[PDB]
């Protein structure tokens, strides 16, 4: 589940699991620090992951929150809270 | 912030934002589905993203939970709960 697709030069399509991009993304972040200290990292990662998720869902549910919240599997309230967090409603 | 590096058609290394690999990863998931209900999407995506983050941070804090939770910016308790969730401690 949850995998981006890629090709090689041989024109074969292969599925690279999403967690691999996340590890690279975290490590490229650290690579871009020197001296700096790392805090509130969880908030960083979640913004990048929740915005596309909420956007993607709202698209398929056609803006219906009760169905968005049912597909995602969280409370209507949490949903309402997060959409605000990202200025999405 | 939070970006994977790729090489492109001009032959240059370039940084694609992690959010884009998430959107792709979600849409390929629906792709593979045909006529199946999807209830627990947020839990899905969150497993894929947390396991690499926890793992990466524990690497850097050398097993130190107090330093792990401070780096991530979550509560010692939360941290402790998530590690259990993922059979990581």
């Amino acid at each position: 589940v949850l995998t981006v697709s890629t090709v090689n030069s041989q024109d074969q399509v292969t599925q690279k699991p999403l967690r691999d991009s996340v590890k690279q993304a975290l490590e490229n972040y650290f690579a871009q620090l020197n001296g700096q200290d790392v805090n509130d990292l969880y908030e960083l990662v979640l913004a990048e992951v929740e915005q596309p998720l909420l956007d993607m869902v709202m698209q398929y549910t056609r803006g219906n929150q009760t169905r968005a919240a049912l597909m995602m599997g969280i409370n209507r309230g949490t949903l309402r809270k997060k959409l605000k967090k990202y200025g999405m409603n």
Side-chain angles (χ1 to χ4, degrees), chain A residues 27-39:
Chain A
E27 261 142 57
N28 294 356
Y29 179 53
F30 275 62
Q32 301 169 314
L33 277 45
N34 193 19
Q36 290 127 303
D37 54 334
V38 45
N39 38 244

Side-chain angles (χ1 to χ4, degrees), chain A residues 5-15:
Chain A
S5 57
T6 54
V7 298
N8 51 34
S9 46
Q10 308 96 298
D11 289 330
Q12 295 169 257
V13 175
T14 183
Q15 297 301 348

Side-chain angles (χ1 to χ4, degrees), chain A residues 51-61 71:
Chain A
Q51 294 174 98
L53 180 46
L54 291 168
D55 196 46
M56 211 272 302
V57 168
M58 291 301 264
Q59 228 83 101
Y60 286 92
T61 51
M71 282 216 5

Side-chain angles (χ1 to χ4, degrees), chain A residues 2 17 19-20 24-25 30 37 43 46 49 53 55 58 61 64 66 77-79 82-83 88:
Chain A
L2 276 279
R19 76 179 61 224
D20 285 343
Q24 298 169 26
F30 275 62
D37 54 334
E43 241 279 73
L46 233 59
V49 186
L53 180 46
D55 196 46
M58 291 301 264
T61 51
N64 184 327
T66 321
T78 307
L79 203 246
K82 301 182 164 312
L83 271 135
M88 300 215 26

Side-chain angles (χ1 to χ4, degrees), chain A residues 34 42 45 80:
Chain A
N34 193 19
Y42 189 81
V45 172
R80 239 173 23 236

